[PDB]
Symmetry: C5
Subunit: 362 residues, 5 copies
Amino acid sequence: PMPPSEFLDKLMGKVSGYDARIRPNFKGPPVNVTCNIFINSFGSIAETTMDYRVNIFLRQQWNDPRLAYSEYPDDSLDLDPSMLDSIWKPDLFFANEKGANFHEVTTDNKLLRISKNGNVLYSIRITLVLACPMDLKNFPMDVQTCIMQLESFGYTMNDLIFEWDEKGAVQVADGLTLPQFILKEEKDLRYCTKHYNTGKFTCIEARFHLERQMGYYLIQMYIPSLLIVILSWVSFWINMDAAPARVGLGITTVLTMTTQSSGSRASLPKVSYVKAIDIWMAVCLLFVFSALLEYAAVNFIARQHKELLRFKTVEEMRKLFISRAKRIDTVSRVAFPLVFLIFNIFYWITYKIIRSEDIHKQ
Amino acid sequence: PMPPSEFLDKLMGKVSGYDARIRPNFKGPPVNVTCNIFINSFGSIAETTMDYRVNIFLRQQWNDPRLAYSEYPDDSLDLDPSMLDSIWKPDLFFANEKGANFHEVTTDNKLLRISKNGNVLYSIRITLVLACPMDLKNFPMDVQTCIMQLESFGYTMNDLIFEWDEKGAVQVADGLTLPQFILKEEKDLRYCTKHYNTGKFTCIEARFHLERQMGYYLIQMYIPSLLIVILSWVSFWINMDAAPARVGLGITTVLTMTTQSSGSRASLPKVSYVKAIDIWMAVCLLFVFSALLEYAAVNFIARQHKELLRFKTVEEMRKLFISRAKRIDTVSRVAFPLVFLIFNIFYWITYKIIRSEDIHKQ
Amino acid sequence: PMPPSEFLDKLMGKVSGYDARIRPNFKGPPVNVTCNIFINSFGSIAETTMDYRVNIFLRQQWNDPRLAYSEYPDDSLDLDPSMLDSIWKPDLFFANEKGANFHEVTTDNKLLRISKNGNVLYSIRITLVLACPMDLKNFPMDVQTCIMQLESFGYTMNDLIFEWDEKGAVQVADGLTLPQFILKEEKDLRYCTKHYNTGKFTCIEARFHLERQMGYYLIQMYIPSLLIVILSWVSFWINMDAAPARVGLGITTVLTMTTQSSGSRASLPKVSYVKAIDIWMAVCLLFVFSALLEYAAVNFIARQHKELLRFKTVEEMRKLFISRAKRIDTVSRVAFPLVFLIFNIFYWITYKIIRSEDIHKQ
Amino acid sequence: PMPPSEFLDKLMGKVSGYDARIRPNFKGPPVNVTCNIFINSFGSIAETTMDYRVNIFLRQQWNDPRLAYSEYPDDSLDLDPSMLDSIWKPDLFFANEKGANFHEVTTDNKLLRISKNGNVLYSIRITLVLACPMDLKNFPMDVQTCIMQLESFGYTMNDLIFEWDEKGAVQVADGLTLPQFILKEEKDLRYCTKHYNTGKFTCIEARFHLERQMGYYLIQMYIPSLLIVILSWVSFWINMDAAPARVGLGITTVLTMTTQSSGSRASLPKVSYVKAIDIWMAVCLLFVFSALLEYAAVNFIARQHKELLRFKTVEEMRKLFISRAKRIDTVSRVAFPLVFLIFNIFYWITYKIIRSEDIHKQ
Amino acid sequence: PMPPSEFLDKLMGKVSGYDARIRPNFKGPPVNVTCNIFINSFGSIAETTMDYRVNIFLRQQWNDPRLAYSEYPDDSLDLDPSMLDSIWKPDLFFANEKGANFHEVTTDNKLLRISKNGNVLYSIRITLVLACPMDLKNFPMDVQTCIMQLESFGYTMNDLIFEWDEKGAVQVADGLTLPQFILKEEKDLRYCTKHYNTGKFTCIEARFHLERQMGYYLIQMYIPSLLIVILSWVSFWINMDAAPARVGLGITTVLTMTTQSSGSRASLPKVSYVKAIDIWMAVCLLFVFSALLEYAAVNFIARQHKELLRFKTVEEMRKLFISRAKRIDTVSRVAFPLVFLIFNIFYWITYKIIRSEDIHKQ
Ligand SMILES: CC[C@H](C)[C@H]1O[C@]2(CC[C@@H]1C)C[C@@H]1C[C@@H](C/C=C(\C)[C@@H](O[C@H]3C[C@H](OC)[C@@H](O[C@H]4C[C@H](OC)[C@@H](O)[C@H](C)O4)[C@H](C)O3)[C@@H](C)/C=C\C=C3\CO[C@@H]4[C@H](O)C(C)=C[C@@H](C(=O)O1)[C@]34O)O2
Ligand SMILES: CC[C@H](C)[C@H]1O[C@]2(CC[C@@H]1C)C[C@@H]1C[C@@H](C/C=C(\C)[C@@H](O[C@H]3C[C@H](OC)[C@@H](O[C@H]4C[C@H](OC)[C@@H](O)[C@H](C)O4)[C@H](C)O3)[C@@H](C)/C=C\C=C3\CO[C@@H]4[C@H](O)C(C)=C[C@@H](C(=O)O1)[C@]34O)O2
Ligand SMILES: CC[C@H](C)[C@H]1O[C@]2(CC[C@@H]1C)C[C@@H]1C[C@@H](C/C=C(\C)[C@@H](O[C@H]3C[C@H](OC)[C@@H](O[C@H]4C[C@H](OC)[C@@H](O)[C@H](C)O4)[C@H](C)O3)[C@@H](C)/C=C\C=C3\CO[C@@H]4[C@H](O)C(C)=C[C@@H](C(=O)O1)[C@]34O)O2
């Protein structure tokens, strides 16, 4: 029978001794805050500035003794979010972030629900440009581990304690997909406490293990390099007397291998360690460069042939240099793709075992 | 005869018991909100970040019993938008969005119209960077279905219910055109209710079917690839003894096919499935590569010819290798464009039937 | 003798019955608002997102009967812009716009001048990213017509009427120049009234006719294409037996024509109609491709010559094929630039007459 | 002995008749405002959108008679910047600007100092994206004159007059350097008064003469073009019978000259007048194109030689065509670099005299 | 026993004489402020606009006598950051900065702690786009010294004095790494006082010495240039009669050296001094150009050979020109890589000694 306006100005009134600046149960045990997040959107992962953009529904549960009411019989009592000025919302800030803008569209995207015993549910929708450092030791295949850290500002560990939720940890939205990565099902909850000269502060973090998909990099980078190496193999069947043809074919394959290697590393930060694509493009470039060196040795042997022919064992030395120049081409035509196939299976199995070692060590 | 200032401070006065924080007909049936949007601008569709930018006139109709007035005889009573602080606007937020900024130019772009019985018309102009996931299984021709979701924050299904309008669904502005797409005439209205641990929330959505126009991709991508394949066909008429000419022509056609294929995929996200342009550029690249292989086989047969000529059935084996080397060119000159025409009609009709299957299944 | 503070708190005081929420002459004829704009900056015209950025001094003149004063003898009475909270500024918003931010530097850039009879002058400085659709049927030469629409939000046609000024329409700043376009001297004032389900709203618009300057596109695009076609003509004088030279020259001219055509269309939206540069680059590419086909026919005739010479009317058939192979080069050397000159004068006069037809139809 | 709180609420109190909306010495002579700016940062000069970014310390000095105090004996009395709401700051706005955001970091970056007789010192730190039109008649060497205009909004010339400072004009920070330009020591102070239909408004402007440094453009653009022309000269020493070598060398030099000319104009607005780099790249491209034409004439004369040799004064006509084909190469080998050196010294001295004429006319 | 609300409204109440506009110990000695910063994130260093982005925890310690309390026995008394409106926070602003936005996510990221004797701890989290000028005299290896200046606005040196902290200077976060640079362990604290016409202002600055990592630039830039020079060395073994082969190989190596040099300078400001990569690419380009000149001299000597052979000491002059043309190739094949190795060791040791001289002079 009681009207709701006096009831919802009674608990936050200045005739009441609420004092929203003062934390609950002052001069006592620390407040325990339970947090669960809901990943609404995850994406826009950029490697060159090492950050990613999430959309989260940050839900914070804490108990306030002064907020308890015994008049109304309903337990939930969902409230309007405009009177969220004097409730004592806890301070929370993300340790590694940029941006972090609120959503003010059509209303402030906020949820306030005060239970009968004093439990408060506080939900806010925020997009954060979270910055995570990434390791690029293996660029085509890799398991990145993005770190999201939630800690407090201005309340030490003896006054405010952040804890993860027990029923579930992180709720991902159904149907959420990433175009370039695959989000793993398990998520780590390791809370570490940062120490500062001012004091220690409560901090909880969650880790997402991101598997990079290998379907795009196989089409864009691995197959055109094989096309270039196969073309340099095609140069072996051409006639050895046709010098501009073989020289031009080999030179253009080396040039396009260099430009392809320079263009695949363009969308990447300037890291200072050797990656896997470096190894792949280096061995492919070495293969086309060795093909050009093989033709240069063949044409040098033919040069020695032509100088000793035109100005005495001349016939059998002509035979020896033509037979040797034919033997080099005949053994190269078999030896080049076989050693390339050997390198391919060795590289692929060692990266398969180091990828499985990364997924086993985690 | 009554002056308007007391009348428009009477209904929102604190001497009145309006209490704009409290929802209408509290502790009763849920409020029913009818929404229709007006697409003022639609465009700026970007594939690489999978989002689009709309300009909408969001109109929300709901009934308030406390707002009803019986003094004035006029039914419409358009009001000034500055006193839209205490009216109980309903909470609405878009589920998949970025940005969503209001228009504050020369006034707040808002409309408030309170009917005599209590019906409230609330119109706001907002630009939203709506994020939609897109399928790129067929890149040149495709029918994208952009999804716009409108749901509530902080009021469950038992307190707030969102419904679409019956007289029309979505009003598009007259003369509105898209440079890259064609907006279909019908629009789906399927409302789905999202479930969360806190509770269930009302949500309505509208789907726009976007037909990608095929006029640009025919000019930019399909015809230059045919030019490259026709040039590789031109290489068959050149003399077989002119080895640097045919080798250089074929090698430059393969190189430019590779760079054209790499440059057409630049304005696209790094997806991990095979698209239609992948198939097209792959078959065209296979055609120019097979032309280079055909010349390599011709010059290998001529090599065998020259070695058996210069160091016995020599005349008729010279005839056999010249006749075979002529026969390969003569059959290739007919066989290459005919099998290309067969591939063209097969690819085009299978993509026509899969495009019509996509438009029939919807 | 009267001090100014009471006089300027008398007309906007709450002891006065001003009521700035209520429109002037309520329950009567509609308010008539006269608007003239002053183009301070115009520029930053981008084709790929189809919008332009203006800086305008929006001046709005309307009459308020309650604001009239008879105490002071001065007629102008320029006022301070801080008390522009309660004046009843009219609602105005641009129909096709993005951005539209106010200038808050060192003060709010505003002007308020209330005349003695009640005329109010309201000037504000705003930069608007106005979005206009453009037609690219003729890309090098074209007359774009940018549309600026000013309409009201929340006041129908019976309550608020917008009208253009009679003394002048749009004042452009002296010395204002555009690097890529030429602003015409006349400007259209056609007011159209938009109709919505809620009601009809007053709207006035102004059109600027923008002539695209042809000096840059002649240097960047038209002359290098002529350089490529002239180089392909140079290929006719080279010796026909030198096959790698003529083949390589023609192939590189075709390749660079393709890359030049692909690079000139890069700063353009993905439109689906044929433009004028498409026609120009297509005919130039057809010319260099026909030159390569002409050399392929010459070397095929020489192939027939060489096969019938080396394995009977042999001398006179050698004469016939050498004379025909010389005649093809001799007639091509004259016939190629003459038909190119014919195409040039036909293309140029038809685009001159369609440009003058566009400027005559307007 | 008087406490400072009553003294600094006495002069701005509502029990005082200060009335900060009303300008000082109302209904009298115009207020005289003295302005000096301090260039803290100058840079980020972009040619393609024709604007530059400054950081200025805007100091405004004006006299207020009502602010005068005779109680305290100190003359300076530096005040706290939070009570800068009611002081009657003058209206000032920059005529050609974008952005112009204030600095709110750790405090509002403001200075308020009220002298004993009524002199007020008002300093604010602002970064402005000032838009200046630039002339690109000579692109490598040029003296740009950036214009910064400071005028008033809403106060005419009879009420507010802006004047420059007498002790100095513009203070540049010590150690301030520009990477691409050189700031001259003198600065023009020409005040021009803008006229509008509403009235005339006071305006003062300052001009900075910016000398473009020529060290970068000599390395990036002038020397690689000389490398290309020297390579085309190297083509003269190669054997005339080696036709693919000379043809390929000349064709690749023409192609790379075209791409170098197209790439140096990329970071520039689409202007419609001929610049100096246009002239330079055009003459260099003409030189490499004439070298290709010279080889085409040599090989045409050799063609006439070969046709009259193989199907009568045959020996002496063979002599005449070989001697003429040698004479063309021998005279070209001397004549090409000498005429290039003549063009170089003529171009360089005419641009030196037109640069000195620009610096003498100013 | 005293409740906290009256105690925390007593010290900031208007019944108290706090007067937060007035600085502490007015008309006396200057306030001494001790500042220490905590580098939370450091990165996003861009060379082309010469600025870097930090995340700092700015801690300011100063003593206020009026804030001292003797009632409560606790010494720390951490307070809520909402009542940081009237505390007299000191004015601080960074001298060389852009941006500098506060963090408003979930609360204002602020810390307020008032000691018992009057010591105030004020911590704020800010991201600043700090602009630092950089010297690019040596581009691959360099030690940049970023300067962060903190000074006051509106309080002179006699009223406000800024001092660095004695216990530590700048705290870097543990685990913080930079992908492109290495942050040195020592940091300079040199405070310089800026002088202005208005007065002198306190300023303290901190310098970070940044070592550029050399691992990326060795892979991206130094090794492909060696690949190009090694390929030009490979051109010496090819047959001298094969003129299109050697000419084409040398010409494409010169062309790709030019494009590689133009592409490595793309991500750099337009500086006007010679860098180290300029010297490296210039010597490598000189090496490949000299190889092309060596082949041109060889083919000129062979031209003289062919003209004196075909139209008398003819045999021994044929011997002299073939022996000399062989001797040039034989001495070049040894002389080119040896002088390249000499240049490599000289360049590397002189840059090692100038890098160590830069790290010794600091
Ligand atoms: C085979 C290599 C040699 C070099 C051949 O290369 C060329 C011609 C002939 C050579 C012998 C080169 C190559 C294509 C082939 C033709 C082969 C087919 C048409 C396709 O390929 C197959 C193989 C591919 O598994 C390696 C396989 O993918 C799976 C992987 C995943 O399941 C594990 C899954 O995601 C999904 C099921 O799909 C799939 C069956 O498709 C063709 C689609 C390959 C892509 C072509 C690419 C298009 O743009 C690329 C690039 O811009 C380059 C410049 C041109 C193309 C090219 O490089 O062309 C290109 O790389 O011709
Ligand atoms: C003549 C064409 C053939 C192909 C010739 O081309 C080449 C060499 C010889 C060939 C026979 C090609 C060409 C230049 C010429 C040399 C000609 C001159 C030096 C200039 O040209 C004249 C002609 C031009 O009117 C067509 C005329 O403009 C007027 C137009 C307007 O009044 C109506 C007005 O705005 C103003 C008065 O100026 C003007 C008198 O200048 C030279 C300045 C032309 C520009 C050169 C361009 C620089 O970058 C361009 C591009 O990056 C490309 C890659 C290289 C250059 C080129 O393409 O070089 C380039 O295009 O040599
Ligand atoms: C040796 C030079 C000649 C020209 C050879 O070049 C080619 C073939 C054969 C020529 C004789 C060229 C070159 C690679 C080699 C093959 C050599 C190996 C595969 C690798 O190299 C070694 C040498 C390198 O120390 C110079 C050394 O790095 C250390 C430095 C640091 O410790 C001090 C530390 O960070 C870490 C330990 O690693 C390391 C042991 O790896 C290979 C990984 C080199 C990188 C290849 C690059 C990939 O993209 C680049 C570029 O896009 C270009 C276009 C193609 C590649 C290339 O240019 O290919 C490329 O540059 O083949």
